[PDB]
Amino acid sequence: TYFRTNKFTSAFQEIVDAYGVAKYREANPGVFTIVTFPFLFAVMFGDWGHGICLLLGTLVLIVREKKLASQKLDDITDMTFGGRYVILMMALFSIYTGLIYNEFFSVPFEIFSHSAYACRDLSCSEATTVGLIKVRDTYPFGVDPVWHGSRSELPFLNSLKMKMSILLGVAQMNLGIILSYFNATFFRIGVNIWCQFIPQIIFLNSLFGYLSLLIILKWITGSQADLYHVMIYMFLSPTDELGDNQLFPGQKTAQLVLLLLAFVSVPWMLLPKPFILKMQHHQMIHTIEFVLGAVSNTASYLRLWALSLAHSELSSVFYEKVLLLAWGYNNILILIVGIIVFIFATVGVLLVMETLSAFLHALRLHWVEFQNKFYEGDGYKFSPFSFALLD
């Protein structure tokens, strides 16, 4: 079978078909991915300036598609013509992503106030002081430039980005579990659904959710020295006892109980379904597959964090080159030459190289999420006798 797809849905359908097909009754998450992959790619990376420019170019292409229908595209241009709408949606999401990142045109910009974030007190004290900076006013539309974009703010910001990516991966896994439950409801198994999907889901979900809730509790408490590694320090002891840093008063005993529950659920993920089948009368693949999937989700979160850090580094390099060209040019000619060279280099790095790399990484992450989620391949497209030349 093949589902009906609009012009925007065409690219999502192409990506889903590349990731196999599914049964006619089997749910197709291609429509959901048509937003999720933009949702992850926006979280993955984004440049406000060139990304807006890329979106404008894609919109111009969509407007001129009437001629592009007549004008045959060349190689990757053909795929671009099909996926223009999806690319535009992804760029639209990346716009809000950059707004969160506050690096407008790959450069921090003040929001609302003259300076979005500043240093309260320490009028004479340097930024490298015990008092250092105090953000009396915090940027409401994005990360505070003092707390993120400044010289020494990079490590804590990167740690926070990685911590947030971990939660995003947990949410993606939960969405996949929800999709699996929906498919099971569509599958309509009287008790086999509870025996198979419920144990396979929820177990690793709560396993990672313990750490996610620990991160939330840390954000509430605001511990400083451990940075984002307080969770690592806590989880470093899978054994009982100790647990001094535990924010929740009962976090230690509850964590031990949760570990025991996960250990008990680990066979429950595998054993019940073959037992029910034998009573009526793969799991070996499902074996260790949960641990591998959790590792893959952690890998996706780490990849997103690394992509964001790399994009920030590239933006910083471009800004440094532009500043060097502008400052060291009393004459207009040197400044113009440097600006043109920097613009060309930054365009090539971001709109082509970084953009393609981020798109590929996001596609890989979405494919992993779908494979863990559902639709299990195993299908093909509906076959009508359409006139290929005419249609």
């Binding site: 079978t1 006619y24 509906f382 009508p384 006798f385 359409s386 006139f387 005419l390 249609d391």
Partner: peptide, 27 residues
């Protein structure tokens, strides 16, 4: 939401039906 279906096309009428259904068709 598809299902199997069969249609018996008369031999003489087969050409016209094929020509009509050629554009998009169903199966």
């Amino acid at each position: 939401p598809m299902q199997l279906v069969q249609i018996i096309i008369p031999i003489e009428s087969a050409h016209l039906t094929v020509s009509y259904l050629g554009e998009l068709g169903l199966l």
